Amino acid sequence: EELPLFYTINLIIPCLLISCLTVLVFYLPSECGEKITLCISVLLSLTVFLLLITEIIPSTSSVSPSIGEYLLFTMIFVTLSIVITVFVLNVHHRSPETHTGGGGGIDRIFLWMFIIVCLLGTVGLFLPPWLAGE
Structure with a gap:
């Protein structure tokens, strides 16, 4: 009764800022400790935007929340x-098929995946008419 399309626009905005953020440190990791630095950063925001949603009280029902399914999916x-x-970066015991000449397009494709799920996941969740049945 107060969560129009706007709710998605305000949730998608940060979804990217936090997404690309993690990829940033993974792209040009200056220090070996930057990893944990980014992890804690996302936590602050995740807990910041979370409480905000609990302030507006989008659902005061017994159970079966609204964003509870989204915030959970993302966090998971x-x-x-x-x-x-x-792990994949920790060590490489097995390979897909290639062996020689490696380590060049894994960075570009890496960030390409994170953003691939952000849009796809969001769209697929909306369940549009074009992808509804026909």
């Missing part, structure tokens, strides 16, 4: 991401 996604991204 970004979570497993930092886990795999850390």
Whole structure:
């Protein structure tokens, strides 16, 4: 009763700032400790925007919240991401197929994925008419 399309515009704005942010430090990591620095940064914002939503009270029902499904999906996604991204970069025991000539387009494709889920995920969640059935 007060969460129009705008709610998505205000949630998508930060979704990118926090997304690209993580990729930034991963692109040009000056210090080896910058990793943890970014992790804590996202937490502050995540907890900052979170409380805000609890102030407007978008849903005062018993259970089954509104954004509760979104904030959870993102937190869960970004979570497993930092886990795999850390391992994949921690060591490479196995490979997809290539062996020689590596380490060049992994950076460009890396950030390309984070943004690929941000848009795709958002759209797919909206469940448009063009992708509804026909």
